[PDB]
Design a protein around this ligand. Structure first.
Ligand SMILES: CC1=C(/C=C/C(C)=C/C=C/C(C)=C/C=C/C=C(C)/C=C/C=C(C)/C=C/C2=C(C)C(=O)CCC2(C)C)C(C)(C)CCC1=O
Ligand SMILES: CC1=C(/C=C/C(C)=C/C=C/C(C)=C/C=C/C=C(C)/C=C/C=C(C)/C=C/C2=C(C)C(=O)CCC2(C)C)C(C)(C)CCC1=O
Lengths: 306, 308
């Protein structure tokens, strides 16, 4: 096996490719339509946000920028927001591009609160989305909540351009998952370490050259890059695996598929995303490859075909 | 100034473009390399459209001759790996060579490989290959698109693989034709269309302001005469522009906004495929192009969408 050959295990897992499709549609819209579309989608999303994600040492990184924006006029604020959407090369857009996803999300959450408070320039009254933007908004509002929030997140994170430590949860307070059909400690402890933010232990489950493929992204290859990804993107998730299957693969490898739900700290139990994990484990029972997929619909939770 | 390039992008915002094309490309980009190759094989086979002899013998293929002949001599296993390296945008000598090529060389390369696949010279899509669930759905989506949208999906997928010519002679004035656009007599728009059809890019570039920009379908504004002229020379050769209808309206500061709808034919398919397009011009008071966007329209209905 190579990483690229591992990518196709369990090939009839149907993923929610409407998400990258919809993001690509959003990417065609001009900056003002993008900002207005997100405003409308966000307001109409009946899902309340918790800002336990993006903590203090993290959000300290965007404080300077947020203080700059808070001192500009409504016209300068609008230009900055458009520079972000346009991925323009400006000092603030470069600052934004340096941040992790949760810092970017917390930044926009604060601007959104200030917009409802009149502290930051609002979407102009009586604004009309372009014909294409109106159709993108309608498509988003037809998606399952888990897909809606992934579209919004990825659009936010793609904006801009030109990590404090995470201490794991105390052992006594930790939960342990139960996965129907799966007894393998490498899979069980992948989930338990994730749920405890115990990334320095989790990385030891991988082969030295092992790879992790997040939803709609390319494989991240090797312990150094995977550990960096854990530390930067994976804090405070709740993984709720339900059921899985295991089967032998070529050369003494083992392939395992698990389905279940994931909650993000931004929405807690209010949004459950339907996920699959597809593992290829080495003969020594280490993770050579794991893919994490956002599933097309709840019907895919029952698709456990070997 | 009354406009910036980014503020010009939104002119005629009721124009409904075929964003199903970038959406479907994004779905295709989720598939692994072998699935991508098989999907394009079946999509290319299901299309009933023929590539022209004039594009088939394109002299620029000499840049790719050595690489193709190398591939032809490889084993089927090596050939498959090369093709996957291309789909994966891997850093290899062959993928770097492909990434150095122009779009037209890239298309001719894959046309030749596909011919060789049918002739038993290059490794075929394996006989017992089953598309993934996602890939089968993407293939079904492509089959439901208008041919002009199908070929745009296929072209963009080809051009995006890999990584890690002489300019056409303008046609003699005596041999040129003149477009006719119902509703539009603006000479800058007519001159844009006629110079494009004549491959007279050095005259065409003089129609733009120095800070002026051109926005190709599903791409970002290309800003400045140097960048735009390089784009004309590299990409826009031997097209046939068939504008039919248009509307002109005043814009701020004495500018003029013009929308034209019509059809475009690529030299790859000749008259076999007519893509429904809009051109959206923002002209300075001095009659120069400050911004022009070229859109692939969502459906033929949009040819009649000529409201402000
Ligand atoms: C932008 C903007 C606004 C603001 C808008 C705002 C504030 C928008 C905020 C939107 C928010 C807070 C979106 C958060 C989405 C989080 C997701 C999808 C996390 C998924 C994680 C997953 C699947 C993890 C999976 C994982 C598992 C299971 C593993 O096993 C391995 C790890 C891995 C990570 C792969 C305004 C409202 C101001 C209007 C203007 C404007 O433009
Ligand atoms: C890859 C592959 C294969 C091969 C597949 C093959 C051979 C695929 C070949 C596909 C081909 C030949 C696609 C050609 C597409 C051309 C288009 C959309 C031109 C558009 C031009 C336009 C819109 C003009 C626009 C213009 C106007 C009007 C302006 O006014 C301004 C300029 C501008 C340019 C913007 C196999 C079958 C071997 C399988 C394996 C595999 O993977």
């Amino acid at each position: 096996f190579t990483v690229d050959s591992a990518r196709g295990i369990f090939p009839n897992t149907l993923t929610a490719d409407v998400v990258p499709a919809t993001i690509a549609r959003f990417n065609q819209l001009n900056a003002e339509d993008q900002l207005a579309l997100i405003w409308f989608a966000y307001l109409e999303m009946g899902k309340t946000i918790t800002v336990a994600a993006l903590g203090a040492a993290n959000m300290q990184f965007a404080e300077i920028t947020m203080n700059q924006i808070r001192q500009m006029s409504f016209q300068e604020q609008t230009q900055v927001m458009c520079d972000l959407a346009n991925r323009t090369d400006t000092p603030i857009s470069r600052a934004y591009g340096s941040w992790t996803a949760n810092i970017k999300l917390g930044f926009w959450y604060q601007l959104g609160e200030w917009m409802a408070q009149g502290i930051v320039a609002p979407i102009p009254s009586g604004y009309k989305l372009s014909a294409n933007a109106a159709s993108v908004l309608q498509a988003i509002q037809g998606l399952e909540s888990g897909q809606q929030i992934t579209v919004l997140r990825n659009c936010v994170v793609d904006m801009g351009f030109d990590e404090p430590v995470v201490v794991p949860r105390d052992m006594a307070q930790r939960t342990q998952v139960t996965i129907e059909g799966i007894d393998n400690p490498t899979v069980l402890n992948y989930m338990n370490n994730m749920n405890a933010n115990d990334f320095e232990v989790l990385i030891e489950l991988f082969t030295p050259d092992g790879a992790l493929q997040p939803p709609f992204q390319k494989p991240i290859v090797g312990k150094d890059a995977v550990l960096r990804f854990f530390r930067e993107e994976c804090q405070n998730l709740k993984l709720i695996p339900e059921r899985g299957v295991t089967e032998p693969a070529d050369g003494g490898y083992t392939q395992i598929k698990v389905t279940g739900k994931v909650q993000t700290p931004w929405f807690g139990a209010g949004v459950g995303m339907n996920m699959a994990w597809r593992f290829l484990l080495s003969p020594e029972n280490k993770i050579f490859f794991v893919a994490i997929d956002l599933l097309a619909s709840p019907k895919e939770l029952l698709n456990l075909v070997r």
